[PDB]
Amino acid sequence: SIGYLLVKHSQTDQEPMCPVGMNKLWSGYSLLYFEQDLGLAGSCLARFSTMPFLYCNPGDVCYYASRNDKSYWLSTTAPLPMMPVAEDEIKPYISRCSVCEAPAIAIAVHSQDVSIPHCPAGWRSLWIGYSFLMHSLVSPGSCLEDFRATPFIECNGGRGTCHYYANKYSFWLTTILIRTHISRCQVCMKN
Amino acid sequence: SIGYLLVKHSQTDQEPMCPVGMNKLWSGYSLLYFEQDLGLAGSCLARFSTMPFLYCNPGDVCYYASRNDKSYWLSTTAPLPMMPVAEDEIKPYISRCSVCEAPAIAIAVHSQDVSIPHCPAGWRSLWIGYSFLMHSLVSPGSCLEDFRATPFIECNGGRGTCHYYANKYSFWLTTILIRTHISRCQVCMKN
Amino acid sequence: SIGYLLVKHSQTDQEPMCPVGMNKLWSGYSLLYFEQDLGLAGSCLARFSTMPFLYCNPGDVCYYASRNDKSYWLSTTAPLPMMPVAEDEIKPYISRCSVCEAPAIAIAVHSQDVSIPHCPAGWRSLWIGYSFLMHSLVSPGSCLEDFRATPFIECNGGRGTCHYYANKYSFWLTTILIRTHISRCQVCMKN
Amino acid sequence: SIGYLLVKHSQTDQEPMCPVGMNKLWSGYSLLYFEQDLGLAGSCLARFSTMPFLYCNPGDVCYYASRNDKSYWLSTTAPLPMMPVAEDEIKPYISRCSVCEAPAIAIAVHSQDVSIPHCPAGWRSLWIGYSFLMHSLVSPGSCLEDFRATPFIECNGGRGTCHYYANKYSFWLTTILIRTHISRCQVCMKN
């Protein structure tokens, strides 16, 4: 690929630092989609919002797009309380991200084992993580620093509330106590 | 991306100048589609036409493709009169564009605020605008210089008339009097 | 684009020469598809064949894929006789092509006029032609050297016969005696 | 293309060596898909597994994704016995692969003949093979070193068994005793 843009997701409420030798392009919040690849720049939205769009009928009457109320975001490691959270108190539980100006290609390598796979000779390790596949394994988006059973949250703009999201189509790669059965990965960049 | 071609839309009846250090490849009119990304070269058509195609049956009989009569274009800032306009008088209301030979990558950054987002260190500002998302935020096509409630017009080739177009699927990014609620953006290019 | 491969279609029964400074990668026949972009390498097939595939059931029994009998090819300028031609006598009417190792980007520019559009400053003209759009205008595939009312032929492998093809979806760009109404184009390459 | 990653499939139970001047990125097993292009890095999975995914409901209960039990792999040249094989004894019959860090572009050229097509002047031969097209001819994935009537096997995770797979949509290119009718190819890389 020619992914000059590398996206780093912290899975914490702190903005991740870009690796040395890369310009931060921008920072924000870890977005999956509004009703995509975590390695693409679209996965990093500057400001958290559950209702970010505005529709305009032919004339001065413009309203907030409120039909497709749902949005999906990468969560932090900090456990969500056992009760749905209002959108005003949800930010602490949303992952932060940065977009970085990679000068070379980055790739994710996966072990399907408890051992971290090695970076190729002459390539530099950017981070290590757990193998995650979404509805592409070579992409950096498939390598999340922390394992979470339910890594995403769903928010309802109209309902004003948020909670963990049971995705039917996205899985973790296994090995061939629970973290001991998840495949490990490393994101590597060529010098 | 490897978008060597940068498209600039003026939203006026004047052809925009390519930024210094870029060859103009060609100029024309701001096309959305005939019955796409504003950042791609296909969005800039050399000459305005509501019926640009020709079909040829097996033999000398060739006719003008007249079934799918509708075309869609980016409008100028100048208000369209309160009455549909004949295709012969529509040109003043169609945006002009230029295609420019970018030597480096360009990206749009978005604030979701009244403040303009900053270009990354060592990158040069090309233009500033308002955040527009169509049925990709990293693309320069998402950053239009002027905000317009209804930014597009629809033309009917058979009906020979044109008017503003209420798109169901395309929105403006909001902030998290009307221009004060639209997200600002800047298109930036690396040196 | 990063189309290092440039495809040249002769619309004659002679193989076109690659432009000076480009390696011929290979030559062959101008293929549209078997039951695509003329600018891509897949449009140039080494040897003409109406039945090029072989299917193998689990075992030694392998047979010729004969269900989807139809293939589509770019024709030469030489008129096809007024009577369907057997597949053994069709080669003279099939366009030849070459694939060339472009060192820089090539683009098609279109005038929507009788005048040839100019190449950008510092770019070199590769060929001139007529604007053709298929079911992308920036691509070299949209610029064919000769205008033909029905530019393609259809061949039936089982029926063993070939004739001109009336495509419902592909058109010529017009201007805004018949050649006088077709848009002109030039394929240009940067130095 | 900008396929910096070249995938080499051995069609044997031995890992292929990357060509001289290319870093091995990783090695593994020749995967088609789980219920793609053999030239892409996704076709090379580090460890063989018929059930590689893990699903997690909202809570501590995580289970093995067992609904879409089927996986598809490139086989070795060694004949599979005339009786379905248990998944524990299948590895010897699965092709191995390596992913290599190509510094230049690689392409497959095809003859549609018994003769090997020549590499372009100044390009180096990487391997020779037989022309294979799947449900793209320019890609290295279309050139397999060994011809096999049924080149793939299907495995059933729940059924725990594996056997050859009759693909309806994938074919061999022909010429215009059985190997004598299959098109030859060569994968070539520019210096």
PDB file of C-alpha atoms in Angstrom, chain B residues 45-159:
ATOM      1  CA  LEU B  45     -15.415  18.838 -17.327  1.00  0.00           C
ATOM      2  CA  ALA B  46     -13.903  21.061 -20.041  1.00  0.00           C
ATOM      3  CA  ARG B  47     -17.168  22.415 -21.495  1.00  0.00           C
ATOM      4  CA  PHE B  48     -20.608  22.712 -19.937  1.00  0.00           C
ATOM      5  CA  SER B  49     -23.160  20.420 -21.547  1.00  0.00           C
ATOM      6  CA  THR B  50     -26.472  18.939 -20.355  1.00  0.00           C
ATOM      7  CA  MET B  51     -26.467  16.363 -23.221  1.00  0.00           C
ATOM      8  CA  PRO B  52     -22.816  15.346 -23.822  1.00  0.00           C
ATOM      9  CA  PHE B  53     -23.218  11.760 -25.121  1.00  0.00           C
ATOM     10  CA  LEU B  54     -23.831  10.203 -28.499  1.00  0.00           C
ATOM     11  CA  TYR B  55     -25.149   6.667 -29.109  1.00  0.00           C
ATOM     12  CA  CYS B  56     -24.633   4.793 -32.399  1.00  0.00           C
ATOM     13  CA  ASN B  57     -26.775   1.861 -33.575  1.00  0.00           C
ATOM     14  CA  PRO B  58     -25.095  -0.709 -35.899  1.00  0.00           C
ATOM     15  CA  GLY B  59     -24.961   1.485 -39.018  1.00  0.00           C
ATOM     16  CA  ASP B  60     -24.767   5.182 -39.932  1.00  0.00           C
ATOM     17  CA  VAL B  61     -27.675   6.161 -37.607  1.00  0.00           C
ATOM     18  CA  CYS B  62     -26.149   7.895 -34.547  1.00  0.00           C
ATOM     19  CA  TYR B  63     -28.345   9.829 -32.080  1.00  0.00           C
ATOM     20  CA  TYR B  64     -27.961  11.917 -28.905  1.00  0.00           C
ATOM     21  CA  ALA B  65     -28.353   9.907 -25.672  1.00  0.00           C
ATOM     22  CA  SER B  66     -31.627  11.415 -24.403  1.00  0.00           C
ATOM     23  CA  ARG B  67     -33.052   8.799 -21.955  1.00  0.00           C
ATOM     24  CA  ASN B  68     -31.162   9.752 -18.773  1.00  0.00           C
ATOM     25  CA  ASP B  69     -31.700  13.519 -19.252  1.00  0.00           C
ATOM     26  CA  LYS B  70     -30.425  14.695 -15.800  1.00  0.00           C
ATOM     27  CA  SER B  71     -27.039  16.210 -14.892  1.00  0.00           C
ATOM     28  CA  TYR B  72     -25.737  17.613 -11.594  1.00  0.00           C
ATOM     29  CA  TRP B  73     -23.233  20.448 -11.090  1.00  0.00           C
ATOM     30  CA  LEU B  74     -21.694  22.561  -8.321  1.00  0.00           C
ATOM     31  CA  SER B  75     -23.301  26.028  -8.220  1.00  0.00           C
ATOM     32  CA  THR B  76     -21.749  29.474  -7.781  1.00  0.00           C
ATOM     33  CA  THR B  77     -22.284  31.682  -4.740  1.00  0.00           C
ATOM     34  CA  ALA B  78     -24.475  34.004  -6.848  1.00  0.00           C
ATOM     35  CA  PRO B  79     -28.113  33.297  -5.958  1.00  0.00           C
ATOM     36  CA  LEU B  80     -30.225  31.478  -8.557  1.00  0.00           C
ATOM     37  CA  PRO B  81     -33.427  33.442  -9.347  1.00  0.00           C
ATOM     38  CA  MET B  82     -36.732  32.268  -7.809  1.00  0.00           C
ATOM     39  CA  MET B  83     -37.832  30.586 -11.078  1.00  0.00           C
ATOM     40  CA  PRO B  84     -36.223  27.701 -13.072  1.00  0.00           C
ATOM     41  CA  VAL B  85     -33.582  28.858 -15.588  1.00  0.00           C
ATOM     42  CA  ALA B  86     -33.267  27.738 -19.216  1.00  0.00           C
ATOM     43  CA  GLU B  87     -30.068  25.753 -20.006  1.00  0.00           C
ATOM     44  CA  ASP B  88     -28.842  28.625 -22.279  1.00  0.00           C
ATOM     45  CA  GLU B  89     -28.787  31.057 -19.313  1.00  0.00           C
ATOM     46  CA  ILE B  90     -27.416  28.595 -16.683  1.00  0.00           C
ATOM     47  CA  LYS B  91     -23.596  28.989 -17.206  1.00  0.00           C
ATOM     48  CA  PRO B  92     -23.221  32.038 -14.865  1.00  0.00           C
ATOM     49  CA  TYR B  93     -24.556  29.857 -12.004  1.00  0.00           C
ATOM     50  CA  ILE B  94     -22.219  26.861 -12.630  1.00  0.00           C
ATOM     51  CA  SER B  95     -18.914  26.697 -10.683  1.00  0.00           C
ATOM     52  CA  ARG B  96     -15.620  26.692 -12.581  1.00  0.00           C
ATOM     53  CA  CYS B  97     -12.683  24.457 -11.805  1.00  0.00           C
ATOM     54  CA  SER B  98      -9.106  23.749 -12.626  1.00  0.00           C
ATOM     55  CA  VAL B  99      -7.034  20.582 -12.500  1.00  0.00           C
ATOM     56  CA  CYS B 100      -3.495  21.118 -11.178  1.00  0.00           C
ATOM     57  CA  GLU B 101      -0.362  18.977 -11.220  1.00  0.00           C
ATOM     58  CA  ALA B 102       0.392  18.522  -7.517  1.00  0.00           C
ATOM     59  CA  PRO B 103       4.019  17.393  -6.827  1.00  0.00           C
ATOM     60  CA  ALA B 104       3.136  16.147  -3.293  1.00  0.00           C
ATOM     61  CA  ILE B 105       0.163  14.833  -1.367  1.00  0.00           C
ATOM     62  CA  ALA B 106      -2.701  17.104  -0.372  1.00  0.00           C
ATOM     63  CA  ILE B 107      -5.137  16.426   2.463  1.00  0.00           C
ATOM     64  CA  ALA B 108      -8.145  18.101   3.961  1.00  0.00           C
ATOM     65  CA  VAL B 109      -8.164  18.582   7.725  1.00  0.00           C
ATOM     66  CA  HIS B 110     -11.375  19.422   9.584  1.00  0.00           C
ATOM     67  CA  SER B 111     -11.967  21.143  12.938  1.00  0.00           C
ATOM     68  CA  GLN B 112     -15.663  20.539  13.703  1.00  0.00           C
ATOM     69  CA  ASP B 113     -15.396  24.121  15.042  1.00  0.00           C
ATOM     70  CA  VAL B 114     -15.572  27.815  13.990  1.00  0.00           C
ATOM     71  CA  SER B 115     -11.758  27.835  14.065  1.00  0.00           C
ATOM     72  CA  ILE B 116      -9.749  26.812  10.989  1.00  0.00           C
ATOM     73  CA  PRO B 117      -7.672  23.692  11.677  1.00  0.00           C
ATOM     74  CA  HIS B 118      -3.912  24.225  11.357  1.00  0.00           C
ATOM     75  CA  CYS B 119      -1.839  22.687   8.590  1.00  0.00           C
ATOM     76  CA  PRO B 120       0.800  20.275   9.854  1.00  0.00           C
ATOM     77  CA  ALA B 121       4.298  21.652  10.369  1.00  0.00           C
ATOM     78  CA  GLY B 122       6.090  22.041   7.026  1.00  0.00           C
ATOM     79  CA  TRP B 123       2.862  21.808   5.002  1.00  0.00           C
ATOM     80  CA  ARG B 124       1.510  24.709   2.994  1.00  0.00           C
ATOM     81  CA  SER B 125      -2.116  25.909   3.026  1.00  0.00           C
ATOM     82  CA  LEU B 126      -3.824  25.734  -0.366  1.00  0.00           C
ATOM     83  CA  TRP B 127      -7.269  26.979   0.632  1.00  0.00           C
ATOM     84  CA  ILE B 128      -9.718  27.155   3.540  1.00  0.00           C
ATOM     85  CA  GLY B 129     -13.360  26.232   3.504  1.00  0.00           C
ATOM     86  CA  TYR B 130     -16.354  24.498   5.029  1.00  0.00           C
ATOM     87  CA  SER B 131     -16.650  20.762   5.746  1.00  0.00           C
ATOM     88  CA  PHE B 132     -18.875  18.989   3.201  1.00  0.00           C
ATOM     89  CA  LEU B 133     -19.518  15.222   3.145  1.00  0.00           C
ATOM     90  CA  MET B 134     -21.145  13.420   0.201  1.00  0.00           C
ATOM     91  CA  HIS B 135     -22.695   9.951  -0.351  1.00  0.00           C
ATOM     92  CA  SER B 136     -13.311  10.807   2.050  1.00  0.00           C
ATOM     93  CA  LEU B 137     -13.003  13.497   4.706  1.00  0.00           C
ATOM     94  CA  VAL B 138      -9.285  13.355   4.002  1.00  0.00           C
ATOM     95  CA  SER B 139      -9.954  14.281   0.461  1.00  0.00           C
ATOM     96  CA  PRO B 140      -9.797  17.920  -0.778  1.00  0.00           C
ATOM     97  CA  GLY B 141     -13.276  17.468  -2.244  1.00  0.00           C
ATOM     98  CA  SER B 142     -14.711  17.635   1.244  1.00  0.00           C
ATOM     99  CA  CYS B 143     -13.505  21.214   1.642  1.00  0.00           C
ATOM    100  CA  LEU B 144     -15.494  23.839  -0.283  1.00  0.00           C
ATOM    101  CA  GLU B 145     -14.487  27.483  -0.113  1.00  0.00           C
ATOM    102  CA  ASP B 146     -18.039  28.823   0.272  1.00  0.00           C
ATOM    103  CA  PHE B 147     -20.893  27.397   2.272  1.00  0.00           C
ATOM    104  CA  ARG B 148     -24.179  27.157   0.349  1.00  0.00           C
ATOM    105  CA  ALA B 149     -27.402  25.694   1.809  1.00  0.00           C
ATOM    106  CA  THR B 150     -28.088  23.985  -1.521  1.00  0.00           C
ATOM    107  CA  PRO B 151     -24.635  23.808  -3.177  1.00  0.00           C
ATOM    108  CA  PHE B 152     -25.761  21.894  -6.318  1.00  0.00           C
ATOM    109  CA  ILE B 153     -28.072  22.398  -9.258  1.00  0.00           C
ATOM    110  CA  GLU B 154     -29.945  19.796 -11.325  1.00  0.00           C
ATOM    111  CA  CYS B 155     -30.508  20.308 -15.082  1.00  0.00           C
ATOM    112  CA  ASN B 156     -33.020  18.506 -17.290  1.00  0.00           C
ATOM    113  CA  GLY B 157     -31.757  18.070 -20.883  1.00  0.00           C
ATOM    114  CA  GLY B 158     -35.171  17.294 -22.358  1.00  0.00           C
ATOM    115  CA  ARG B 159     -36.920  19.901 -20.197  1.00  0.00           C
TER     116      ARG B 159
END
